[PDB]
Amino acid sequence: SMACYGGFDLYFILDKSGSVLHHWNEIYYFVEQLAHKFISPQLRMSFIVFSTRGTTLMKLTEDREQIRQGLEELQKVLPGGDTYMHEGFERASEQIYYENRQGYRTASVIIALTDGELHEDLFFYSEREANRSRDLGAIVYAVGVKDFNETQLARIADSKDHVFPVNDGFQALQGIIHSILKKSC
């Protein structure tokens, strides 16, 4: 946009299924490396998990005391259950709609994860709720932890370029979150 974003946001939507059962420590190290890096207090971030209940594990807050308390919760999340990636997106879309009632032009960044991909009808609602999140004014980045399908996460994100493998993920998203930060206020 022409005007800079008065508030900047960041949504960590993390899979905690039985398919990430051996790779949660790789996911939590990816979240902490994006949380303890961006120490700027203008960033309001949120921690969303999904296995069966799409749960907001940390609300949309900015202060680094609650975020460090939130990362104490993510370190003890035992993986287990199904993969409802459409309910990880409803927790984002019930926060974008709650924060579009102010007047600012903000920016919401979505980070989604999966090792074992979804069933045929679980993918359909996740495609619908990602469209629900895109229509509310967000940008979706489907970060890929180990072996997945590049085509399947391309329907969730904006395009196939927004999907990154997690070993390239912090290589990518170090400057992609920073891409808006060199355009923001």
Partner: protein, 246 residues
């Protein structure tokens, strides 16, 4: 020999859901079927079980469990009705401590990936011991129905084929202690919702080896005992003769 629910689990009438003569026998009925099972180490946590589905093991050959001419009789008959007889050995020495729980669980789906269809043989070698997570305690991993795009998919929070891991001693069981025995002897009869179930798709029993006390041994002493088992069907009644299953 821990007989189950009767004095003699060999006693079994022919099924009342057939009009033909049952194939009561086959070419080697007084022999056992020995298969490997994954070794028990120190890193195995408490309640990390390992399920051997019967007769799901004769088909997938879980641990080299070759069924000989019982699998080749099960594939050539539609309805099958037998009572099992397992025998798990594990060479517990004086130098080990710990206690397995060998049970014969009725009607559970413990070989099923809490996230899909049925387990392969490579994936039984990768994990080696199925950890008792929140899914296996709440039954949240028996396979969910494909509802379709119309119905909104509900949050599946429970399923009746759980394991309550603290209650597995209600089943026909013997505890493979470090200082009472080295092998168990369980003999179970036929059960089922019908007088005889199918052959390719029945799971009426399940051999279940659960670690109650984790293995501890001194370094340099006897290390990592192997677990074998020996399944043997007692009085089968094969109905519905047809050709080999496709």
């Amino acid at each position: 020999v821990l007989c189950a629910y009767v004095e003699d689990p060999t006693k079994s009438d022919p099924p009342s859901s057939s009009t033909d003569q049952p194939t009561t026998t086959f070419t080697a009925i007084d022999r056992w079927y020995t298969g490997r099972l994954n070794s028990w180490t120190k890193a195995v946590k408490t309640f990390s079980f390992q399920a051997v589905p019967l007769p799901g093991a004769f088909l997938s050959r879980q641990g080299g469990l070759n069924g000989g001419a019982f699998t080749a009789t099960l594939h050539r008959h539609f309805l099958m009705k037998c009572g099992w007889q397992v025998q798990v050995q594990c060479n517990l020495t004086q130098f080990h401590q710990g206690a397995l729980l060998v049970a014969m669980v009725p009607e559970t789906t413990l070989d099923v990936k809490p996230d899909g269809k049925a387990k392969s043989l490579q994936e039984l070698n990768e994990e080696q011991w199925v950890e008792m997570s929140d899914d296996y305690r709440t039954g949240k991993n028996m396979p969910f129905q494909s509802l379709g795009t119309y119905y909104r998919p509900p949050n599946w929070t429970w399923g009746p084929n759980f394991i309550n891991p603290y209650q597995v001693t209600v089943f026909p069981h013997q505890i493979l202690n470090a200082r009472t025995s080295t092998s168990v002897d369980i003999n179970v009869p036929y059960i089922g919702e019908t007088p005889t179930q199918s052959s390719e798709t029945q799971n009426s029993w399940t051999l279940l080896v659960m670690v109650l006390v984790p293995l501890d041994y001194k370094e340099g002493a006897t290390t990592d005992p192997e677990i074998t088992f020996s399944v043997r069907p007692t009085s089968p009644y094969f109905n519905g003769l047809r050709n080999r299953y496709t």
